[PDB]
Amino acid sequence: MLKYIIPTMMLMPLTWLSKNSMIWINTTLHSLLISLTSLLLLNQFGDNSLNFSLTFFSDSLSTPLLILTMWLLPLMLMASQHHLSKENLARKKLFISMLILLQLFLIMTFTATELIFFYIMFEATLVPTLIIITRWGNQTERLNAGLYFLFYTLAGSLPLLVALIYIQNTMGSLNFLILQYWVQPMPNSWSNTFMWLACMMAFMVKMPLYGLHLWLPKAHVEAPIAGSMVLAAILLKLGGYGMMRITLLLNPITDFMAYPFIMLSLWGMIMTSSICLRQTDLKSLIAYSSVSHMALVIVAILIQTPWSYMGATALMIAHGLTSSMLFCLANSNYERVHSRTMILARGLQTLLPLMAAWWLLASLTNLALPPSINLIGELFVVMSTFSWSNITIILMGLNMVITALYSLYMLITTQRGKHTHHINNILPSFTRENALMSLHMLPLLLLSLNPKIILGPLY
Amino acid sequence: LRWQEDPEPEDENLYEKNPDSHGYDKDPAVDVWNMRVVFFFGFSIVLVLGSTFVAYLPDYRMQEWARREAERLVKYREAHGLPLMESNCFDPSKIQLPED
């Protein structure tokens, strides 16, 4: 994995020694070269994972999240370069350095052989994201979110730390490869119940869980575009990756500890999708859509069937691409009308036809139009949860109505109807913006041809 | 009154000073070469050669082998009269059960 970490670190002398008009071009070029390099991780096997060293490994779960992570950096550099034009050059290089450092943390978070190195890199990803959100977020009003981050630290990552140190003392190792063969059944006891909550609640907030999703339509709103792209595309999926690693140790107690949280997600995707029908803020609507889609990944991990893991990792990759494109479309209107109000600028297909085509395609991938991998992930999760319980199809299908309903409403409000009269700064689409939409959508459409590379280790 | 403050800067239009602006930069040569870099190393390099790489992956997770191996083993046990698959994954002779 050291053929990826070292070029990502060499992006730091590349971004600090570059000429002042060249720092976007150079970082975009070399991060696209790293993303082309990232396809060497597709050397996967039907029995063995790709095990590089004592520190790094890659099965077919971590590999597509790595490719999506290394692909997300050039797109963030394209998306965030317009609204940093009047920024200081040194502050602009600090922004690019925090993006590069976040990629550096993520690409060795997903490959972490041992679980406390996963914990260190997992909680290391929060700091450059925090600095990007609070130094370039264009407004900061976080009176209620401070107490929620305190709740995240109390109920989340610290019990995970104590639990992983406990497994280190009990099993003697936290290597996931060793824990594949030295796993003991975790029986019914109160010690094992608090053990399960400690191993799971950090990743429950990171997904997020319904009821615990209070941070996500704030942190998505108060962020720049690169921060919202990396939150929607990668930083939610650390929770799902960590659940799919840590549920190896949590058998068979998961088979009766999943029942509350499954309810919290199965009803929760009914609520948040419905919440998207009453959103004034477009970026908040995409945030609650992200909650409504990660609820299915929570259910699919907690029911731990093969079809559910295949659908959950396909849904993670697909929703990463789709929701990142949705935030980029929301920014491509916000950079013109200077307000996130979804009822402000209407009828935009009269003014921007190709951009409305991109809105249509991102909406159709948002509502899981087949054969897109949004639908493949959605569908396999629905099949596995039907095998879990035959009634849940109702709570699936009703969600699959409301998921359609706000997806086209977001299309109908922003793009259709009568244009707003008093807005006359609606410029034509820059080639940068259309390139950003295409570099989201065309990989998402090409993955419908060959979905087997995004269906996880047990395809 | 309130403090000494610089006023709100108006949103610039990149089409005024450069009607051929792609939106990457306000300097037109930098803008056009940023466009060429994004389009070449994004579309000509990663998407096209990447789809060519993924399409010709050498039996990604040994599926094709596993079909052809099955085409051996069925042919080995249709002909020798065996059942096509045993109900036990391992040999039941080499297994010691707990007695009662």
């Binding site: 370039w136 977020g137 264009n138 407004q139 009003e141 200077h338 | 403090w3 709100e8 800067p9 949103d11």
Partner: peptide, 19 residues
């Protein structure tokens, strides 16, 4: 349209003896 920063009202909350 630009980025928000502390005003006098935000800054005076950290100038007393106690928080």
């Amino acid at each position: 349209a630009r980025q928000w920063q502390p005003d006098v009202e935000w800054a005076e909350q950290y100038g007393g003896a106690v928080m």
